[PDB]
Amino acid sequence: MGGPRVVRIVKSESGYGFNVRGQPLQHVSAVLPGGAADRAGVRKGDRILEVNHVNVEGATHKQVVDLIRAGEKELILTVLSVPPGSAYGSVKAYTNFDAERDALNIETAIKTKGVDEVTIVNILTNRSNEQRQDIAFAYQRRTKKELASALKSALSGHLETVILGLLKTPAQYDASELKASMKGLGTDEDSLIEIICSRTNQELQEINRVYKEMYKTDLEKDIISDTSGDFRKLMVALAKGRRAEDGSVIDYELIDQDARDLYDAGVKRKGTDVPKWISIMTERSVPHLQKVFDRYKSYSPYDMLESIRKEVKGDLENAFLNLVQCIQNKPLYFADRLYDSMKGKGTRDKVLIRIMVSRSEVDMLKIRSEFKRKYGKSLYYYIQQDTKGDYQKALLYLCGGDD
Amino acid sequence: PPDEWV
Ligand SMILES: [Ca+2]
Ligand SMILES: [Ca+2]
Ligand SMILES: [Ca+2]
Ligand SMILES: [Ca+2]
Ligand SMILES: [Ca+2]
């Protein structure tokens, strides 16, 4: 049935972004993805019980709409939801969130003599990504300046990279990182492989759509322009995000045949049948490939990762090693990349920042668990020893705590 | 059924 809960939609000049329908309580029939209502927690099927603290039981459809459209400011709704996931992310939605309050406090920190970077970090790294979008809209509405552009001018160094990354939606951030990894002579293959190998179907579908809107070209077309050989074939196949979905039935016969084919195409023979590896590892569901990799050990003297190191080299080897890691244990995969970015001289800040930003609301808690288990000390500890200043503090907030 | 976007 759903308990009466309060959602707070920020003032939006383009509309709150949800459809009111009814016949008695009016219900929400559809929600614009990424719109103001979507970010505040309004979901499909919500029955509207109060609009800005007035009970609308028995009101007409026009009256509920007119009450919603009246103030032209924020929209506080009391909704009854069909009782319905970011449960392992470090950054949670801030309770008692007020975008206007945060926007004004952020502008105060920007206008503070010398720029109050501390307050900017304390706010933005302790709000969810959707809450940051609400702040950005309220900021522009009161300053007539875009928040990202204002923060670009106020901040610098690695802290600027972090803050600007947090302000983008997940699909916008991934799309811009992909573009940055391909733009310019050559390519950051490691950045391209990390994103393409680790993102799921749903994520890649939104990345492809957002990439096309941001840059007016297909992501697949830019991957082709900047890659070649079997590496291109693998990246193009993964980037389509059309992997088979996790099924209810375990296909034990296919698991065995897939494991034989991987062996026959690689260790068993001289050379490698690279397209056979690509077909199996990009088309089968992740739970399927997990069991394929264990069954593969029944035929091969080396496991899947070791077989890759012996068969292929270069970018293709890197891509296969990253992909198999993501299929086997993705939190452990990111934990190892985090360790690699800090273990030696200096810091691979680009990698550290991108992981802390993109995984903060996905599986950072599992990343921290795999990290502490494998390396003995916390991810928090390594960030402290490798980074300094407000830049360090923002990364520590994205981490979420010690251990 | 009446509907409208807001
Ligand atoms: Ca300062
Ligand atoms: Ca700057
Ligand atoms: Ca290039
Ligand atoms: Ca071979
Ligand atoms: Ca270091």
Residue numbers in the entry:
A (entry chain A): 38 to 60, 77 to 137, 142 to 460
B (entry chain B): 77 to 82
Quote the study that presented this structure, word for word.
The human proteome comprises 266 human PDZ (PSD95/DLG1/ZO1) domains 16 and about 4000 putative PBMs, defining a network of one million potential interactions. PBMs are mostly (though not exclusively) C-terminal, with their COO- implicated in binding, and are classified based on position −2, being respectively Ser/Thr, hydrophobic or acidic in classes 1, 2, and 3 17,18. PDZ-PBM interactions are rather transient and promiscuous. Viral proteins bearing functional PBMs are found notably in HPV and HTLV oncoviruses as well as in HBV, WNV and coronaviruses including MERS or SARS-CoV213,15,23–26.
According to its logo, SNX27 normally prefers class-1 PBMs, with Thr or Ser at p-2. Yet, SNX27 also binds (pKd = 4.56) to the class-3 PBM of MERS E viral protein, with Glu at p-2. The structure of SNX27 bound to the PBM of MERS E shows a p-1 Trp of MERS E interacting with a hydrophobic groove of SNX27 including its β2-β3 sheets and a Leu side-chain from its β3-α1 loop. MERS E has a class 3 PBM (Glu at p-2) with poor match to SNX27 logo; yet MERS E binds relatively well to SNX27. In the SNX27/MERS E complex Trp at p-1 of MERS E establishes favorable hydrophobic contacts. We found out that the closest interactomic neighbor of MERS E based on Euclidian distances of our explored interactome is a class-1 PBM, ARVCF. While ARVCF is a class 1 PBM with a p-2 Ser, it also possesses a Trp residue at p-1, similarly to MERS E. The p-1 Trp thus stands out as the major PDZ-binding specificity determinant for MERS E and ARVCF PBMs, more relevant than the class-determining p-2. While the nature of the antepenultimate p-2 residue is useful for classifying PBMs, it is not fully operative for predicting their PDZ-binding specificities.
